[PDB]
Design an enzyme around this catalytic site. Structure first.
Site, short mmCIF file in Angstrom:
data_model
loop_
_atom_site.label_atom_id
_atom_site.label_comp_id
_atom_site.label_asym_id
_atom_site.label_seq_id
_atom_site.Cartn_x
_atom_site.Cartn_y
_atom_site.Cartn_z
N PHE A 36 0.79 -1.22 0.00
CA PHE A 36 0.00 0.00 0.00
C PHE A 36 0.82 1.28 0.00
O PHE A 36 0.26 2.34 -0.29
CB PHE A 36 -0.97 0.02 1.19
CG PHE A 36 -0.30 0.01 2.54
CD1 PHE A 36 0.03 -1.19 3.15
CD2 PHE A 36 -0.03 1.19 3.22
CE1 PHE A 36 0.63 -1.21 4.39
CE2 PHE A 36 0.58 1.18 4.45
CZ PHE A 36 0.91 -0.03 5.04
N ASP A 37 2.12 1.24 0.30
CA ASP A 37 2.90 2.46 0.40
C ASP A 37 4.37 2.13 0.22
O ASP A 37 4.82 1.04 0.60
CB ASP A 37 2.67 3.17 1.74
CG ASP A 37 3.17 4.60 1.75
OD1 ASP A 37 3.69 5.07 0.71
OD2 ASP A 37 3.03 5.26 2.79
#
Length: 107
Positions: A36-37
């Site tokens: 996600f990041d």
């Protein structure tokens, strides 16, 4: 419950303290899930300080337990970051977070 598992090298003595701005090439990961990041994607290595409640609690406690050049592996509990609420669309409620953290800082 901040459980540290460190990939060895660094110096093991340059410790993050209060009033210090530090630089982390972090990388997020969801448990049993996809990414996600990543600070490595934007190549902007997220200059931040310690003590002003900027980051979540699980990443804040994991910052002081490291040193320069080190490479840890966080496991953030749900109750410290988002497990009741969850960030809208990005972080589901009651989620357990995984972080690939390398500290290459100043100060």
């Amino acid at each position: 419950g901040v459980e540290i598992e460190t990939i060895s090298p660094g110096d093991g003595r340059t410790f993050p303290k209060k009033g210090q701005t530090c630089v982390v090439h972090y990388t997020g990961m969801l448990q049993n899930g996809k990414k996600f990041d990543s600070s490595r994607d934007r190549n902007k290595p997220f200059k931040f300080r310690i003590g002003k409640q900027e980051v979540i609690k699980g990443f804040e406690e994991g910052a002081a337990q490291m040193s320069l050049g080190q490479r840890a592996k966080l496991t953030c509990t749900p109750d410290v970051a988002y497990g009741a609420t969850g960030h809208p669309g990005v972080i589901p409620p009651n989620a357990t977070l995984i972080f690939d953290v390398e500290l290459l800082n100043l100060e």
